[model samples]
Target: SFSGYLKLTDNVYIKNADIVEEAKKVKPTVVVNAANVYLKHGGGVAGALNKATNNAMQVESDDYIATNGPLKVGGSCVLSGHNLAKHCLHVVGPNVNKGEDIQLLKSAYENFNQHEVLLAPLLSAGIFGADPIHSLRVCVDTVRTNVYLAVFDKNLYDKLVSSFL
Candidate 1:
């Protein structure tokens, strides 16, 4: 018998048959759709946006889903995540202070090169407590040549190359 939104059910018996084989007998999943990017933060379920996005896409969707953390805004949002659409996916972070996560910074450097012009640190000399000499060395080691560094700490920037040359 049929009811509102309910269809007739047939009872069948199966004995030790391969699940895949049996499932193949049924209809395959639909074509569905795709997403240009999938942004995720770590250590939590997901916020409103993330939840909505996940529901819209399939588990097997070819769309990129890179896990990071806390999908808010600010702090390299555009730089680290902009490419996450048609090009790649980005991981935001497990935020810590002052402690250098060289690996993540290295990845950021690689990602930054995709866009040529970067914001100048202009006044980063006194702020951020960063030493340009060490910063330049790190940059050279991480990205190799064919990169640019617009440094405000001219004195420290020049000091970086004096001995390495």
Candidate 2:
């Protein structure tokens, strides 16, 4: 419902907006999917994404897994979403039960490197239980490309845009 921005640097950024709606507006950009290790685009933001892309994202996600083997936790990659925003970047957040979830989350934030504009959801704030503030810092600290943290929750949106220390 609200939009805000915090410039991370010259090229990278942190913003709160609807990732799915934003994906439609930015031509030739990539939208990062907060995905699973199996590359399944099931629920949450991932589910909204497939419906928006007319299930094309899911189809290619299947292809990506078939070729690359199952992606490890915190691993990331991109697929030719075939471009309301060009492609969908896939990132599997760390399974907290597994060792070193934060480092893996940091690594997940490392993808989406080869684009001018990128839209991302909170890498794990929802089902993955990562705090919005925690996920925000890693993306700001680690992401190498220009990016938007398209947050959709009101409480999370406010908390993230306000935490600037």
Candidate 3:
């Protein structure tokens, strides 16, 4: 039945995959970015909902909302930095289970420099899975809102969160 790690939706003319067969190969990751429009135009934290959702679903990565405004519904998730990730990071913060992670996040921004690229996904990710939700909340509140991304790779997934996180 299943054969590979990548799946494409079912189609007719040039169908490359089927529904039942595609759901078997999905390895998720953490996707975080920033947007100038969000920092500039988006009224509150829920700057762009649709765009964030699209990007999150696109890579099967958890998504959250973060900006210079009060947190909203979809913006429940927050972003934070972790010593683990090289650039952008979103560790637990302002939550119970990970309350300590939140306290440290308060004074962590003084570290990231100006060379980083931040691309915000306006459309937020639907607070889907449990673990992702925790990470998503941290993401929206702590992830560096500025980091020039070269690419999105999952090769370092195990390496990124293999430790305490």
Candidate 2: tens digits of C-alpha lDDT, residues 1-165: 113556766645665667777777665367788888887878888888888888888888888788888887877787775555667777888755444466787878776565666777878767677767888777777777777677777777777767656
Which of candidates 1 and 3 reaches a greater TM-score? 1
lDDT of 1 by residue, 1-165 (tens): 101111111211112222122222321121001111233321122122123344332222223334343332111333111111221122232222344343343444343344432221211112323344444444445443233233323354345435432
Assess candidate 1 and give its lDDT.
0.27
Using lDDT as the measure, the top candidate is: 2
- Position 92, candidate 1: lDDT: 33
lDDT of 2: 0.73
Best prediction by TM-score? 2
Clash number for candidate 2? 1
Q: Lowest-scoring 10 consecutive residues by lDDT in candidate 3?
A: 6-15
Which residue pairs show backbone clashes in model 1? 41-68, 41-69, 42-68, 42-69
lDDT of 3 by residue, 1-165 (tens): 223322111110111222111221211122223222122213222223213333332122223333244332222223331221222222122222322233333333222222243322212212211232233334334434342111112332222233213
lDDT of 3 at 98: 22
- Candidate 2: regions farther than 4 A off: 1-9, 97-100
- Superposing all C-alpha atoms, what RMSD in Å does each candidate have to the true structure? 23.9, 3.0, 16.9
